[PDB]
Amino acid sequence: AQNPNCNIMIFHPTKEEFNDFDKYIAYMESQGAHRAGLAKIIPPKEWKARETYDNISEILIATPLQQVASGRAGVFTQYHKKKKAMTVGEYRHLANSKKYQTPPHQNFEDLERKYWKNRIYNSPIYGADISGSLFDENTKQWNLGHLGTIQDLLEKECGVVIEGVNTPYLYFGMWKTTFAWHTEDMDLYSINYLHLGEPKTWYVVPPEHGQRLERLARELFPGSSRGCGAFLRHKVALISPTVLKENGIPFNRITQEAGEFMVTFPYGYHAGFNHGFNCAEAINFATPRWIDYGKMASQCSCGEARVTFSMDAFVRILQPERYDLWKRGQD
Numbered sequence: 001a002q003n004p005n006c007n008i009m010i011f012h013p014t015k016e017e018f019n020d021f022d023k024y025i026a027y028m029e030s031q032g033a034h035r036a037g038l039a040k041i042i043p044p045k046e047w048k049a050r051e052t053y054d055n056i057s058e059i060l061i062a063t064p065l066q067q068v069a070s071g072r073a074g075v076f077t078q079y080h081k082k083k084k085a086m087t088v089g090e091y092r093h094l095a096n097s098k099k100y101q102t103p104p105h106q107n108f109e110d111l112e113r114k115y116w117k118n119r120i121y122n123s124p125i126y127g128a129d130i131s132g133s134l135f136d137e138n139t140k141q142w143n144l145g146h147l148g149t150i151q152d153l154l155e156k157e158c159g160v161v162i163e164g165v166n167t168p169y170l171y172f173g174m175w176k177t178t179f180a181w182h183t184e185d186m187d188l189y190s191i192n193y194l195h196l197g198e199p200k201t202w203y204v205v206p207p208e209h210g211q212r213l214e215r216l217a218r219e220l221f222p223g224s225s226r227g228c229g230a231f232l233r234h235k236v237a238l239i240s241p242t243v244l245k246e247n248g249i250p251f252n253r254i255t256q257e258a259g260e261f262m263v264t265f266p267y268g269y270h271a272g273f274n275h276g277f278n279c280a281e282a283i284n285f286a287t288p289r290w291i292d293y294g295k296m297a298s299q300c301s302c303g304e305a306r307v308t309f310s311m312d313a314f315v316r317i318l319q320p321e322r323y324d325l326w327k328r329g330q331d
């Protein structure tokens with residue numbers, strides 16, 4: 001078995017190897033990459049997502065989110081308070097302000113220490129889930145707005161034709177902006193490209209150990225657990241590496257820098273934070289190996305997680321029994 005310790009793998013495709021997306025994903029899995037839950041892909045040196053970022057300030061963040069924390073430094077929840085709309089230009093200025101900017105630090109490790117020590121005492125502002133793309137239409141390789149769609153994968157593998165579309169989303173982050181512990185909708189893959197700015201640190205639990213994380217989460221957030229049988233789908237809970245180590249949960253960490261892709265694999269729980277002002281683009285995708293994870297994916301039926309038009313069809317076809325009760329939570 002390849003990659004038996006479930007380490008995060010880093011790949012350096014040639015421009016020749018960067019032409020066929022599906023084939024490269026299947027290559028990485030041949031080498032065991034999926035066992036970690038997360039992989040890094042460094043694009044060929046000749047490749048570019050676009051010519052420059054010089055004119056992005058006019059993108060609108062219609063609902064910036066202030067991420068308010070509650071709990072203790074290593075075990076907290078976050079709630080997203082909606083703020084007034086601002087442009088990317090206004091957001092970048094805010095991120096660079098004395099109140100919100102990255103503090104002085106020695107290296108990524110000192111900064112990680114400062115994040116876990118101090119996150120709860122601040123409320124950084126996140127521009128999340130903004131439909132759109134920053135890839136130039138002329139970028140033919142690994143363009144997240146030109147991937148084959150999950151609906152087309154389900155059609156090719158299973159023969160069924162369903163409604164829905166699959167498009168990317170932009171994320172604008174600042175120091176301390178945080179993504180809570182989660183897997184993707186329907187335990188899909190994701191791919192995330194860091195277009196510009198400061199790094200993003202990731203934590204990930206191997207898929208084969210995801211239930212260990214869930215059992216810890218039920219112990220640490222007991223009333224959330226009683227309220228919903230899949231409350232990590234609400235994307236509100238954080239658990240530090242120190243706490244994970246104290247409770248024997250297998251995990252890994254890695255820092256993504258500007259110009260790099262990350263792939264998350266089905267049922268790979270992940271969480272993380274941003275080091276300073278940045279812009280990432282991400283989209284879900286599927287492969288044939290995903291289908292069985294889609295069938296087995298947990299769902300939020302308490303009604304908090306409240307998910308897409310396109311996820312409806314996935315639930316209807318892959319989880320017909322749940323269909324019913326799940327759409328009661330989503331209506």
Ligand SMILES: O=C(O)CNC(=O)C(=O)O
Nearest residue numbers: 171179190191192280282
């Ligand atoms: O970048 C972020 O804020 C969150 N991204 C992801 O969870 C992802 O790409 O799966």
Ligand SMILES: [Mg+2]
Nearest residue numbers: 055056058059
């Ligand atoms: Mg613009």
Ligand code: NI
Nearest residue numbers: 183184190264
């Ligand atoms: Ni994710």
Ligand SMILES: [Zn+2]
Nearest residue numbers: 228300302304
């Ligand atoms: Zn729920």
